[PDB]
Amino acid sequence: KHSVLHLVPVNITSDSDVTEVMWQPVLRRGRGLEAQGDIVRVWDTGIYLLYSQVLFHDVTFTMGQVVSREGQGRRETLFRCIRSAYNSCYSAGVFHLHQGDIITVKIPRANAKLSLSPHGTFLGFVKL
Amino acid sequence: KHSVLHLVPVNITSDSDVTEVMWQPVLRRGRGLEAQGDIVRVWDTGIYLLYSQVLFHDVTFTMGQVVSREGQGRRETLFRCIRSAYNSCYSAGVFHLHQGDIITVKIPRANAKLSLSPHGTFLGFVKL
Amino acid sequence: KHSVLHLVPVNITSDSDVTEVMWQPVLRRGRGLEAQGDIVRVWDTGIYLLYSQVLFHDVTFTMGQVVSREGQGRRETLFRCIRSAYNSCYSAGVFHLHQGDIITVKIPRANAKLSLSPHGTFLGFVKL
Numbered sequence: 614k615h616s617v618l619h620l621v622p623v624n625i626t627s628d629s630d631v632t633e634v635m636w637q638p639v640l641r642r643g644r645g646l647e648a649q650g651d652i653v654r655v656w657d658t659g660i661y662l663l664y665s666q667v668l669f670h671d672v673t674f675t676m677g678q679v680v681s682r683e684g685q686g687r688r689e690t691l692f693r694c695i696r697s698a699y700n701s702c703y704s705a706g707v708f709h710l711h712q713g714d715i716i717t718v719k720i721p722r723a724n725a726k727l728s729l730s731p732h733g734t735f736l737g738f739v740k741l
Numbered sequence: 742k743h744s745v746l747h748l749v750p751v752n753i754t755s756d757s758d759v760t761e762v763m764w765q766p767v768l769r770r771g772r773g774l775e776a777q778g779d780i781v782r783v784w785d786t787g788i789y790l791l792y793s794q795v796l797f798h799d800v801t802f803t804m805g806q807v808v809s810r811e812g813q814g815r816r817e818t819l820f821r822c823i824r825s826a827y828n829s830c831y832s833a834g835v836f837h838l839h840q841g842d843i844i845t846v847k848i849p850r851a852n853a854k855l856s857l858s859p860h861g862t863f864l865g866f867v868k869l
Numbered sequence: 870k871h872s873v874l875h876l877v878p879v880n881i882t883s884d885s886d887v888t889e890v891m892w893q894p895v896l897r898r899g900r901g902l903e904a905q906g907d908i909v910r911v912w913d914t915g916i917y918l919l920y921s922q923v924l925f926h927d928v929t930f931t932m933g934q935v936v937s938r939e940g941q942g943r944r945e946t947l948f949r950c951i952r953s954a955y956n957s958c959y960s961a962g963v964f965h966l967h968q969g970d971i972i973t974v975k976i977p978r979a980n981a982k983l984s985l986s987p988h989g990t991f992l993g994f995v996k997l
């Protein structure tokens with residue numbers, strides 16, 4: 614029976630020129646993944662479907678979300694979503710994640726206006 | 742072996758200031774879900790991947806789709822898709838659905854111009 | 870244990886008024902699917918989740934991706950993604966694929982400017 618994790622915002626954090634989300638579980642089955650604030654640690658090695666929506670509010674020229682992993686201190690962008698007030702940006706893919714990996718959802722602009730609403734912005738996992 | 746349901750439009754319905762789709766199955770395996778017109782009833786409790794695309798045609802200021810569930814008469818928005826002629830809006834997530842739940846895909850504007858085409862607009866389920 | 874395939878660009882091909890991608894595997898488990906250049910052959914009949922992102926660069930009026938299958942020489946559009954410089958377009962669905970089927974990701978404009986970057990443009994499969 615599939616291990617799953619669906620995360621929703623609690624607050625939006627930002628000197629570093631990026632903006633992140635503190636995540637909180639609303640659905641969790643199995644336990645090879647743990648949200649710890651603005652990241653999600655991977656504890657069980659496997660292949661995962663990973664999906665991310667971000668609902669943007671800014672009037673900025675360009676914005677989007679960047680989903681990455683960092684293993685032995687050397688980061689990789691898994692996927693990203695990009696779009697030129699209110700606008701959601703969805704992307705997802707399937708990826709080999711290892712124990713020790715950290716997963717992030719960053720936005721490369723500082724102080725980005727995003728929806729905290731759980732049906733607008735959310736991150737999720739299905740172990741396959 | 743995974744239970745799945747992929748639904749495609751048959752017609753577009755609208756006094757209530759919303760617009761809905763009458764859905765029809767093109768792929769179905771297993772049987773804990775049943776489309777009944779503009780809704781999909783849930784009969785088998787479980788965790789489901791749920792995905793929704795809507796191809797919009799309107800020149801309106803803002804539009805998008807709103808995917809919700811109603812159990813004991815108290816609705817919850819699971820996720821939504823939003824964008825500022827021809828434009829598709831995709832979103833998806835994983836959610837705990839219970840038997841008795843009704844699933845809807847509504848658009849909060851009246852008489853919304855949407856594609857009926859099965860490759861533009863579609864709703865789907867994978868029991869996990 | 871689920872069979873999966875995640876493909877990323879190697880080059881972008883185009884007299885025919887369309888543009889395609891030559892794909893390359895970065896994740897592969899099981900073996901009922903094979904990328905052969907700009908297509909992916911299906912060898913194991915089954916139900917698959919199929920997802921496609923394309924990151925566009927053009928300043929064109931309209932563009933998007935068209936994911937189709939061809940069995941006995943008679944093509945069907947499974948799904949498509951559409952949007953009116955830098956912009957990603959994501960869609961996905963679940964579909965019954967048969968052995969012998971060819972899967973394509975085409976863009977109906979000639980010489981389309983797309984990102985080759987693996988985190989911007991990508992095609993993927995999960996056998997269910």
Ligand code: NI
Nearest residue numbers: 615743869871
């Ligand atoms: Ni399974």
